Every structure is written in C-alpha cells, then in structure tokens.
A paper describes a structure:
Cyclophilins are peptidyl-prolyl isomerases (PPIases: EC 5.2.1.8) and are characterized by their ability to catalyze the interconversion of cis and trans isomers of proline. We determined crystal structures of seven human PPIase domains—PPIC, PPIE, PPIG, PPWD1, PPIL2, NKTR, and SDCCAG-10.
However, data were collected for the remaining 13 isoforms, and binding to CsA, CsC, or CsD was noted for six isoforms published previously (PPIA, PPIB, PPIC, PPIE, PPIL1, and PPWD1). Additionally, the NMR-based assay does not require substrates to contain chemical modifications, and can be used to measure effects of amino acid substitutions at regions distal to the target proline not measurable by other methods. There are three distinct classes of conformations adopted by this loop: the PPIA α1-β3 loop family, which includes PPIA, PPIB, PPIC, PPIE, and PPIF; a shorter version of the loop represented by the structures of PPIL1, PPIL2, PPIL3, PPIL4, SDCCAG-10, and PPWD1; and a longer version found in PPID, PPIG, PPIH, PPIL6, and NKTR.
Numbering used by the authors: 138 to 301
The structure:
C-alpha cells in the first residue's frame, strides 16, 4: 500500500516545517520506490542535506540533485537513469510530485513539486505522488523563487524519511 514519506525543510537558517507526500506505487511502482529509498537512505545515499536548487514562482520547486546541486547530477537506486514508467498521472494542480529529466527515459533522482497546474508537462514528465500535509511549507519554498529559478535563500532538506 502506497508509501508515505516526509521532508523537513529549512529555509536560510530557519526551520520551515514538514512536507508529507504520498507516493503512487500503484501507478508507478519503480518511480515511487526510487523516491522512497532516496528519502530513507536505505541504499546508502539520498536526499538528506540536499537543496531545492531551482525554484520558479507559480510553476515548481525542483530538487534531488544530491551530487552536483545544480540540475546536472543525481542518481537513481537502479543506476544513473531509468525509463519513464507511464504518463497516467497528469500535472493537474499544485502539490504534485513529478520527475525532472533530460529527455525520454532519463529519470534519476531529480524531482519537482508543482506550484500550479503545469499541464504543458503532461506526457513529458512522470508524475508519481502528491503532498498530503504541508502545502504551506511548499508555498514557503516557492516564496524563495525567482523568474530565472535562482533561490533567494538556500532551501535545504534538513531531514527526510518514511512513515513505516
């Protein structure tokens, strides 16, 4: 049954609160499992201490690049990259989890949290989960965005894990 995970967010030197997310293992099991493991660090690496390096107001907050911290890095639990499982889940509104990529079948660890309906990404990025608690914390992340995506203050995943 669908995993639930959390990230505790720190903005600048200040704790912002916790985002809780439901992962859609029923629809995209490989994609959900990757993100789950990256929250728990059970495969030896993951999101803790990494940043949201690209934040665009009214669009999305992107993170998961825990190797290069700039959108060029990251890795999945399966290797550097894995296939797009399917595009069943659509970018219908804010608070959705979706995989960042560099073209078809290039999923690694980078992901974004949507801040509005982003339907122009449908069929291009794999949606795999949703925020169940802490939409307000996501809005605090978004508040640090700029049009060119540069964060105004550092946004860090201070802690993360699974409810299990």
């Amino acid at each position: 049954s669908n995993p639930q995970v959390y990230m505790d967010i720190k903005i600048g030197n200040k704790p912002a609160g916790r985002i809780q997310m439901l992962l859609r293992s029923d629809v995209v099991p490989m994609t959900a499992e990757n993100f789950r493991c990256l929250c728990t660090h059970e495969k030896g690496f993951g999101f803790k201490g990494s940043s949201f390096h690209r934040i665009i107001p009214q669009f999305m907050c992107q993170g998961g690049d825990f190797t290069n911290h700039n959108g060029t890095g990251g890795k999945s639990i399966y290797g550097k990259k894995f296939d797009d499982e399917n595009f069943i889940l659509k970018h219908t509104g804010p608070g959705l989890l979706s995989m960042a990529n560099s073209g078809p079948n290039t999923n690694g660890s980078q992901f974004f949290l949507t801040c509005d309906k982003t339907d122009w990404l449908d069929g291009k990025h794999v949606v795999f989960g949703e925020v169940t608690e802490g939409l307000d914390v996501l809005r605090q992340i978004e508040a640090q965005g700029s049009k060119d995506g540069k964060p105004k203050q550092k946004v860090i995943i201070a802690d993360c894990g699974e409810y299990v």
